[PDB]
Amino acid sequence: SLVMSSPALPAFLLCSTLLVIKMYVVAIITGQVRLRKKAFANPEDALRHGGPQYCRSDPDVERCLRAHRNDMETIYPFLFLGFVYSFLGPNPFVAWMHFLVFLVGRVAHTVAYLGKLRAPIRSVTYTLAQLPCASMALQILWEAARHL
Amino acid sequence: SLVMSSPALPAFLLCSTLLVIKMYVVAIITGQVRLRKKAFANPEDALRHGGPQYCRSDPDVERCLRAHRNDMETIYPFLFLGFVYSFLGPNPFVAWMHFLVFLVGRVAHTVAYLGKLRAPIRSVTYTLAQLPCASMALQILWEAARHL
Amino acid sequence: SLVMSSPALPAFLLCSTLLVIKMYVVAIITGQVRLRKKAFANPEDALRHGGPQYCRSDPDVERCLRAHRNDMETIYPFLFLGFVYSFLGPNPFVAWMHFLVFLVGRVAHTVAYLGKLRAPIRSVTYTLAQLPCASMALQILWEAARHL
Ligand SMILES: CC(C)(C)C(=O)NCc1ccc(Cl)c(C(=O)Nc2ncc[nH]2)c1
Ligand SMILES: CC(C)(C)C(=O)NCc1ccc(Cl)c(C(=O)Nc2ncc[nH]2)c1
Ligand SMILES: CC(C)(C)C(=O)NCc1ccc(Cl)c(C(=O)Nc2ncc[nH]2)c1
Ligand SMILES: CCCCCCCCO[C@@H]1O[C@H](CO)[C@@H](O)[C@H](O)[C@H]1O
Ligand SMILES: CCCCCCCCO[C@@H]1O[C@H](CO)[C@@H](O)[C@H](O)[C@H]1O
Ligand SMILES: CCCCCCCCO[C@@H]1O[C@H](CO)[C@@H](O)[C@H](O)[C@H]1O
Ligand SMILES: CCCCCCCCO[C@@H]1O[C@H](CO)[C@@H](O)[C@H](O)[C@H]1O
Ligand SMILES: CCCCCCCCO[C@@H]1O[C@H](CO)[C@@H](O)[C@H](O)[C@H]1O
Ligand SMILES: CCCCCCCCO[C@@H]1O[C@H](CO)[C@@H](O)[C@H](O)[C@H]1O
Ligand SMILES: N[C@@H](CCC(=O)N[C@@H](CS)C(=O)NCC(=O)O)C(=O)O
Ligand SMILES: N[C@@H](CCC(=O)N[C@@H](CS)C(=O)NCC(=O)O)C(=O)O
Ligand SMILES: N[C@@H](CCC(=O)N[C@@H](CS)C(=O)NCC(=O)O)C(=O)O
Numbered sequence: 001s002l003v004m005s006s007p008a009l010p011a012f013l014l015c016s017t018l019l020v021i022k023m024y025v026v027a028i029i030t031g032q033v034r035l036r037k038k039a040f041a042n043p044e045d046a047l048r049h050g051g052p053q054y055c056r057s058d059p060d061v062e063r064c065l066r067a068h069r070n071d072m073e074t075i076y077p078f079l080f081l082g083f084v085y086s087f088l089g090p091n092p093f094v095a096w097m098h099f100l101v102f103l104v105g106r107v108a109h110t111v112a113y114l115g116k117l118r119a120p121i122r123s124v125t126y127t128l129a130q131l132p133c134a135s136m137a138l139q140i141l142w143e144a145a146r147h148l
Numbered sequence: 149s150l151v152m153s154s155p156a157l158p159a160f161l162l163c164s165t166l167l168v169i170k171m172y173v174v175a176i177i178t179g180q181v182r183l184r185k186k187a188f189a190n191p192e193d194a195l196r197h198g199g200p201q202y203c204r205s206d207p208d209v210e211r212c213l214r215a216h217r218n219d220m221e222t223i224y225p226f227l228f229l230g231f232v233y234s235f236l237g238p239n240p241f242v243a244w245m246h247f248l249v250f251l252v253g254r255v256a257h258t259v260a261y262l263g264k265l266r267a268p269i270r271s272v273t274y275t276l277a278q279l280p281c282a283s284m285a286l287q288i289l290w291e292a293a294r295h296l
Numbered sequence: 297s298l299v300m301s302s303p304a305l306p307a308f309l310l311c312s313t314l315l316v317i318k319m320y321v322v323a324i325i326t327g328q329v330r331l332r333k334k335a336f337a338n339p340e341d342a343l344r345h346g347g348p349q350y351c352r353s354d355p356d357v358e359r360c361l362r363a364h365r366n367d368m369e370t371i372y373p374f375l376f377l378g379f380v381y382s383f384l385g386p387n388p389f390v391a392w393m394h395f396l397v398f399l400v401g402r403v404a405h406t407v408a409y410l411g412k413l414r415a416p417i418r419s420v421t422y423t424l425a426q427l428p429c430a431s432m433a434l435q436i437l438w439e440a441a442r443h444l
Contacts, residue, residue, distance in 0.1 A: 150384075151439055157443075161436055164376070165433050165436045166437070169437075171373065190362075190418075196415035220368060220369070224372055227376045
């Protein structure tokens with residue numbers, strides 16, 4: 001198998017795929033909140049589900065969208081950075097720690113966001129998860145630059 | 149060529165690249181709608197194109213933005229999942245079917261969204277396209293876990 | 297090192313990683329503007345930082361969000377396209393030029409957007425940066441199709 005290309009790769013692929021699934025869960029939650037609160041973005045959706053007055057914004061829907069957007073602002077870069085980083089021959093335990101901190105940080109972020117936990121709990125989880133991303137980015141920069 | 153690294157890779161690269169181009173088309177459509185409806189997000193844009201009153205929201209512009217955002221919520225994960233999945237030695241025909249269902253589902257989604265087709269046509273196309281993504285995610289999880 | 301897999305790869309990894317860091321800078325700027333202008337998206341954030349009246353929109357915050365979103369609409373596709381393109385054996389100088397035009401175009405885009413430069417400066421930087429992306433997409437299409 002080509003997953004054995006690098007010692008850190010399986011750990012990366014596990015954490016990244018779990019986080020993609022976690023984003024899919026947010027998407028599903030968003031849809032279920034739209035239906036339960038009857039708050040649709042489109043008139044065609046609203047007319048199917050009770051009438052044109054249900055084409056409206058809702059605070060819980062907007063919150064779900066913000067969590068999903070923040071995921072796109074953070075998890076997508078990790079998908080790129082963590083993949084490249086996996087092939088730079090990092091220490092397996094150190095790599096594991098990078099991936100685990102991001103995984104735990106991001107899962108905690110979604111729980112804090114959707115669960116409406118007091119500030120700055122969500123903010124701290126964002127910063128915590130950004131740390132391994134910043135670390136990997138710098139390491140990729142050094143490897144790329146030295147190979148020019 | 150390194151496209152011959154795996155039998156499923158060319159099919160993946162064709163479908164993914166077509167979908168990226170499809171996202172670029174949505175971006176172009178969005179810009180053209182902004183100009184035609186004179187609905188700009190920025191005062192500097194508005195002042196160039198008729199005056200400050202044209203810094204305003206528009207339902208068709210917002211619809212275009214929603215289609216583009218939904219693309220980012222779905223196609224970007226596919227770019228990651230489908231790439232990794234291509235290297236897991238899946239059955240070539242089965243892999244083809246995963247990529248084709250996503251491609252057809254997503255193109256149909258954009259047509260349904262921008263064309264304002266009746267509910268739940270758009271919703272169904274989203275769910276249909278998510279199926280192969282869910283499938284690939286699970287398969288990656290198993291391969292990653294078994295290599296830890 | 298696996299960065300020596302293709303002659304164009306180090307150039308790609310340098311430009312892409314710089315652009316991811318550039319997106320992180322936009323995220324940080326956004327947060328700092330929220331705090332300085334006291335414009336928070338969440339009631340829990342607002343109550344921590346002065347009261348419920350500070351859960352409000354702000355034009356500068358919205359501008360930052362638009363720049364970040366446009367980055368997601370353009371840089372993320374480049375991360376995929378440029379990576380694949382790096383392995384298609386392109387002319388090293390030609391590949392360099394693709395990556396440099398995108399890097400300069402996108403950095404200029406963020407400066408033009410956040411700096412509120414007159415139209416159509418921002419619009420032109422977007423189009424300029426899309427050119428190498430369009431080029432790479434077509435090249436990937438040809439390579440993928442010919443390997444089917
Ligand atoms: C799980 C997910 C699809 C994300 C969701 O809950 N979306 C909310 C949602 C929003 C607007 C509409 Cl119109 C529907 C709808 O009716 N859908 C449908 N009807 C029959 C089959 N499918 C659903
Ligand atoms: C195709 C795409 C670029 C996505 C589009 O249609 N954007 C809408 C758009 C929005 C605001 C402005 Cl200010 C312009 C504009 O004037 N642009 C320009 N002028 C000269 C060269 N370029 C265009
Ligand atoms: C740099 C970045 C994190 C992106 C930023 O400036 N965010 C703005 C922001 C928005 C809402 C809140 Cl509630 C905070 C906050 O208090 N955060 C915090 N307190 C203690 C530790 N961390 C910050
Ligand atoms: C990956 C998906 C994680 C979903 C986490 C959802 C956390 C729900 O948490 C709930 O939030 C409610 C407010 O939204 C509160 O009223 C409840 O007390 C709380 O249990
Ligand atoms: C947003 C603020 C994050 C700052 C923390 C930076 C993360 C540290 O990252 C470290 O950088 C060093 C120098 O590049 C490298 O030698 C290490 O391998 C790397 O772990
Ligand atoms: C990848 C880009 C696909 C673009 C699909 C656009 C579909 C346009 O479809 C059009 O939508 C209009 C409302 O928006 C309707 O008035 C028209 O009847 C319909 O033909
Ligand atoms: C959103 C709901 C989607 C549920 C459909 C799941 C897609 C099925 O996916 C299947 O999963 C099996 C077990 O992991 C694997 O053995 C198969 O290879 C895979 O095709
Ligand atoms: C990657 C991050 C790039 C940040 C570029 C910020 C450019 C700031 O530019 C500033 O913009 C202000 C309006 O916003 C103007 O009042 C100032 O004249 C101008 O210097
Ligand atoms: C948005 C408008 C962009 C149009 C510019 C297209 C970029 C040109 O791209 C070129 O395409 C040729 C044919 O596919 C290839 O032979 C070249 O390698 C490629 O550089
Ligand atoms: N787009 C973000 C940029 C800054 C950011 O990612 N902040 C973190 C920590 S405060 C966050 O959880 N933001 C909430 C959000 O993105 O909706 C924002 O507007 O807040
Ligand atoms: N962000 C999505 C999450 C759920 C989703 O992706 N739903 C599908 C099927 S109903 C969709 O086409 N949503 C429309 C959209 O994202 O604008 C939303 O708010 O609806
Ligand atoms: N989502 C974009 C699609 C078109 C686009 O990317 N336009 C460029 C050049 S005018 C841009 O800088 N748009 C500003 C933005 O996305 O906020 C939009 O609404 O404008």
